[PDB]
Design an enzyme around this catalytic site. Structure first.
Site, mmCIF file in Angstrom:
data_model
loop_
_atom_site.group_PDB
_atom_site.id
_atom_site.type_symbol
_atom_site.label_atom_id
_atom_site.label_comp_id
_atom_site.label_asym_id
_atom_site.label_seq_id
_atom_site.Cartn_x
_atom_site.Cartn_y
_atom_site.Cartn_z
ATOM 1 N N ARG B 99 0.872 -1.173 0.000
ATOM 2 C CA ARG B 99 0.000 0.000 0.000
ATOM 3 C C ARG B 99 0.907 1.220 0.000
ATOM 4 O O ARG B 99 1.614 1.476 0.979
ATOM 5 C CB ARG B 99 -0.930 0.012 1.216
ATOM 6 C CG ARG B 99 -2.026 1.080 1.185
ATOM 7 C CD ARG B 99 -1.549 2.414 1.700
ATOM 8 N NE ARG B 99 -2.648 3.361 1.894
ATOM 9 C CZ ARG B 99 -3.022 4.301 1.028
ATOM 10 N NH1 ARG B 99 -2.402 4.453 -0.141
ATOM 11 N NH2 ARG B 99 -4.035 5.101 1.342
ATOM 12 N N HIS B 126 -7.449 1.073 -6.777
ATOM 13 C CA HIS B 126 -7.724 0.153 -5.629
ATOM 14 C C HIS B 126 -8.201 -1.155 -6.290
ATOM 15 O O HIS B 126 -9.338 -1.519 -6.108
ATOM 16 C CB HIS B 126 -8.695 0.746 -4.618
ATOM 17 C CG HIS B 126 -8.703 0.055 -3.301
ATOM 18 N ND1 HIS B 126 -7.905 -1.025 -3.031
ATOM 19 C CD2 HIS B 126 -9.403 0.294 -2.176
ATOM 20 C CE1 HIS B 126 -8.119 -1.432 -1.802
ATOM 21 N NE2 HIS B 126 -9.023 -0.637 -1.256
ATOM 22 N N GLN B 129 -9.835 -4.088 -4.187
ATOM 23 C CA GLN B 129 -11.201 -3.813 -3.760
ATOM 24 C C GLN B 129 -12.179 -4.121 -4.882
ATOM 25 O O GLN B 129 -13.260 -4.673 -4.639
ATOM 26 C CB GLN B 129 -11.338 -2.360 -3.318
ATOM 27 C CG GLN B 129 -12.763 -2.006 -2.931
ATOM 28 C CD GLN B 129 -13.109 -2.634 -1.612
ATOM 29 O OE1 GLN B 129 -12.418 -2.423 -0.606
ATOM 30 N NE2 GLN B 129 -14.181 -3.412 -1.595
ATOM 31 N N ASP B 222 -18.116 5.923 -2.029
ATOM 32 C CA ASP B 222 -16.840 5.901 -1.329
ATOM 33 C C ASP B 222 -16.757 7.227 -0.579
ATOM 34 O O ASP B 222 -17.441 8.191 -0.939
ATOM 35 C CB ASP B 222 -15.702 5.708 -2.353
ATOM 36 C CG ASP B 222 -14.332 5.589 -1.727
ATOM 37 O OD1 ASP B 222 -14.224 5.324 -0.514
ATOM 38 O OD2 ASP B 222 -13.345 5.753 -2.482
ATOM 39 N N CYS B 255 -16.747 0.747 -0.469
ATOM 40 C CA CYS B 255 -15.496 0.076 -0.139
ATOM 41 C C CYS B 255 -15.131 0.125 1.352
ATOM 42 O O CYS B 255 -14.394 -0.754 1.818
ATOM 43 C CB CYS B 255 -14.413 0.665 -1.023
ATOM 44 S SG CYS B 255 -14.141 2.348 -0.645
ATOM 45 N N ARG B 283 -13.029 -9.200 0.235
ATOM 46 C CA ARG B 283 -11.625 -8.810 0.140
ATOM 47 C C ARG B 283 -10.712 -9.996 0.438
ATOM 48 O O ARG B 283 -9.708 -10.216 -0.259
ATOM 49 C CB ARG B 283 -11.338 -7.678 1.117
ATOM 50 C CG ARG B 283 -11.988 -6.344 0.744
ATOM 51 C CD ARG B 283 -11.317 -5.638 -0.439
ATOM 52 N NE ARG B 283 -9.895 -5.420 -0.160
ATOM 53 C CZ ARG B 283 -9.401 -4.384 0.506
ATOM 54 N NH1 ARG B 283 -10.197 -3.420 0.944
ATOM 55 N NH2 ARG B 283 -8.094 -4.311 0.733
#
Lengths: 303, 298, 298
Positions: B99, B126, B129, B222, B255, B283
């Protein structure tokens, strides 16, 4: 059985060091063949100052021995602060089968080892880095075979933990060790004396010099390390000791280069040396995994 | 021949389908695949912490038989070159999950490392996700090809970009509804339009939230940000009025984390259209499938 | 099934507490004989404030049940800041089979337990330390046998988490509990009332006194804890003179760390009456038993 510890390189005799290094080669070949910590049993891995690379190698190595590393880094107070070191050792001895500790002063490691009823391993301290030197010796053996009689020269800050451990661990292996450093950054005389004494048993020798070209001459292994742990060019005294192509060209034709990493390219070592055919730094970094596992296996079965 | 997963379209449509099929298999049988038995290591590195990313990857790796070495927020690149770090990591682990902020650092790591590199979350994308989102949509609605998905809110962020790229890779008609200052990066949008040509999908960017909700099978939002500075986004709130414009059996994704009352309301997030908790669970399954798939191709 | 939690000591009935303590003795004898978390399944171990000795006992206990602990230290986004605690609990429930949490106010533990679909366990909180008291009770039982009718006295800060849990957990075991503490540091009145009500079902009793010598007389077990505001607690020091007033075979407990020379003296700490090291070890076994028991009821 007496509980065995590994706080400095000469805590192993020459015969005991050979046993650990043989086990390191066996474990590199068969990394999950030894499961002394199956259960899992725990091993404490404690950092008074963080070292991420030290944590990869121990945390994965302990897992491959069947165990579970409980990692405690600097963000969790400090051992000795809110209870005595002795009380801490007694509790840890109830939860884990060995204690791996990165700390500063050697007297703290000594105090931990005298009270704990499980093996204590120095992961890295101000005075010594003996697990790194086990990995260095495993690497040298891989590249050159017999360690006895090889000539190893270390360059740069000769007062640091790597200089001390290359002296002690090197002469234990029968290696003729030279430290090349400016006069204000020489090996501690007590460490040098202990290395000279151990070298008498193995046929090795100890040399301290401020002449980098003389130290490189005919060397089989050239080693360096970052000059400081953290305007004015404060590292100016070390720059004549840079491990560069000219220095490497003075060593034996088949010489190899070690560096415990991280490297500051352009300071203690050049790109040309780091990335050239003499470099063994990547195998060396990998061998931290194998040599530390071998050390743990060996300590646990004597303790 | 080492494969990486840095952005959604790093998988072709056929490859994405393979990963999503594996994700469904692993959800059914979570310890049936043990490519990391040993354990073998996987690095999980956070330049900025994320609890849900940590749980999903750490446990997923463990259920593949491996051991995640989790490194929290000295930052990679500060004490030694990224290339030196990549070489040492490649001796210790079988994959690198990272990340980080800028996409160029992920690109640099993937170009040097001799093991698969996975983008756990970046400023631009992402993609893990969106694998979880696609798994969730498939288990609620079946075939993905031809579904209509609309994303609402900040259309310039990592989720908008990944829903575009990953959605069109699955054959989904993707709409991004956002105010004009917060639209998808035109280079990403162009890459999604080109990918959509291969899958029958389409890309729509609009500032009309009601039009984007009309006829939608899936509505997604989001958080708007990571004086009412978020005022531009409030007309794009995923609320009951917006949901009522969509298909009667539409589902809702988010998310997480959610800021209830801002981009989504309590009534929607806790109501019967919400798939947010299954989405979060997936996930774990989708990232496990991705790792299995990358490890066997590397 | 009803999902069972353990947020305070009286969340176990007297019969249930006896089951957990019996399991703790069984697991001490055979530490890897119960593997309900094999797979591995996950368990969250989350610290709002670090406690390394809580970390060792839980992380290794979970591993010895076959599971994988995902350990989150302080210094990530404190839970409750970027999403509600309830949302965190719902997502954690999709990744792990139990949530172990060291936090502050009881209302935070209540918030997660209100929606979690897995057991929530208080690892240590401001108001209670119920896992420590399970370890204490296991230690007392293995030295003295039946717990009902024993006399236990706690000395020092009677308003802290150990005083509260020794009251609640002690009376649940049938123990006559005395808290010897100065004015201004007495048990929370609702906790005291709950312990008085629970003592009626077990034959136990609750006594609160400022007379440390009277509290020591006839005691089977003397307990203390750090006092942190030092002046009020000096008369309550667990010293050799106080220990001599107790039963000739009384044992001494102390949830570590000890401040030697303050609440307890070296002579007591290191003498033959001290059971503090076995007590600390039993955090491992007692917490493993609790997890086994909660998992099979949830």
């Amino acid at each position: 059985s007496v509980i065995r510890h590994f706080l400095r390189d000469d805590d192993l005799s020459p015969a005991e060091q050979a046993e650990v290094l043989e086990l390191a080669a066996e474990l590199k070949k068969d990394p999950v063949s030894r499961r002394p910590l199956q259960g899992p049993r725990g091993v404490a891995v404690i950092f008074d100052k963080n070292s991420t690379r030290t944590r990869f190698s121990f945390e994965l190595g302990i897992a491959q021995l069947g165990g579970h590393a409980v990692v405690v880094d600097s963000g969790s107070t400090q051992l000795g602060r809110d209870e005595t070191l002795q009380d801490t050792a007694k509790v840890l001895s109830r939860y884990v089968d060995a204690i791996v500790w990165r700390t500063f002063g050697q007297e703290r490691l000594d105090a931990m080892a005298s009270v704990a009823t499980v093996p204590v391993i120095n992961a890295l301290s101000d005075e010594f880095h003996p697990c790194q030197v086990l990995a260095d010796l495993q690497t040298i053996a891989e590249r050159k075979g017999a360690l006895r009689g090889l000539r190893l020269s270390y360059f740069g800050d000769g007062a640091n933990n790597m200089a001390h451990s290359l002296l002690l661990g090197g002469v234990t292996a029968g290696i003729h060790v030279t430290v090349a450093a400016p006069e204000g950054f020489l090996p501690d005389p007590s460490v040098r004396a202990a290395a000279e004494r151990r070298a008498q048993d193995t046929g090795a020798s100890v040399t301290v010099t401020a002449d980098a070209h003389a130290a490189a001459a005919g060397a089989d292994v050239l080693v360096t390390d970052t000059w400081t742990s953290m305007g004015l060019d404060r590292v100016k005294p070390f720059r004549p000791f840079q491990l560069n192509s000219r220095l490497l060209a003075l060593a034996d034709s088949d010489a190899i280069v070690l560096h415990c990493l991280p490297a500051h390219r352009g300071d203690e070592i050049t790109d040309a040396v780091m990335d050239g055919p003499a470099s063994a730094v990547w195998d060396e970094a990998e061998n931290r995994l194998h040599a530390q596992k071998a050390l743990l296996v060996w300590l646990l079965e004597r303790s």
